[PDB]
Amino acid sequence: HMKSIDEQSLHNARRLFESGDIDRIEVGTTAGLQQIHRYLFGGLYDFAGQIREDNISKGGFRFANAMYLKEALVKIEQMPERTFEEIIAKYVEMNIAHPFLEGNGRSTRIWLDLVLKKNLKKVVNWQNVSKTLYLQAMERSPVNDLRLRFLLKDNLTDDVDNREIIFKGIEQSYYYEGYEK
């Protein structure tokens, strides 16, 4: 049956890695996140790669106000990346920014892995990070990022070029957002 947006986007994510285009993206910047988003969602959402102008929320949580989102992103992208703790803090702020109308979670997890890979030579082995534990750690993270830090730290891998880790991690990441083939 015709591919859904999420299914085609998962194919786009796989291609991002298969083609090597993943490693030609800016790391740790707003523009690099936009690049990822455009690769994942170009042709699928008209706003692929575009910073939102509208406010968004999920549950009882409102993401950063569009009114000062661009200003926030400039500060976020200048945050340091030299330790695991710093990188998670930067990720937590980029999640709070949530700069697109859709596709924030999936694009920003790829973004995080590029920052980890560049600075620590590690990535998250997402296939081993449960959806329930991830989502609860993310919900806690604005106030206290310790649960998220430990969850991700416990699931780091140095096998950053392994196909199975990459592809199973894409699958897991998309499953966090509700998609399973």
**Burial of residue 43 (number of CB atoms within 10 Å: 0-12, 13-18, 19+):** exposed
Rounded to the nearest 10 degrees, the angle between the axes of helix 69-77 and helix 30-41 is 110
Q: Is 20 marked within a binding site?
A: no
* CB hemisphere CA count around 59 (13 angstroms): 6
Q: Which is nearer to Cl ion, 99 or 103 (CB)?
A: 103
Region 67-126 residues binding Cl ion, contact defined as CB under 5 A: 89, 103, 105-106
* Residue 68 engages a copy of itself in binding (rule: CB under 8 A): yes
Cα-based angle 134, 148, 102 (whole degrees, multiple of 5): 55
Q: What span, in angstroms and rounded, lies between the C-alpha atoms of 111 and 30?
A: 10
Q: Is 58 marked within a binding site?
A: yes
> For residue 54, what are its two tokens?
């509208």
From 13-21, 50-58, 146-154, 172-180, give the range in contact with Cl ion by CB under 5 A: 172-180
Q: Which residues are annotated as a binding site for ATP?
A: 58, 95-98, 103-109, 131-134, 177
Q: Which residues are annotated as a binding site?
A: 58, 95-98, 103-109, 131-134, 177
Site residues, a copy of itself (CB under 8 A): 57, 60-62, 65, 67-68, 71-72, 75-76, 79, 93, 96, 139-140, 142-143
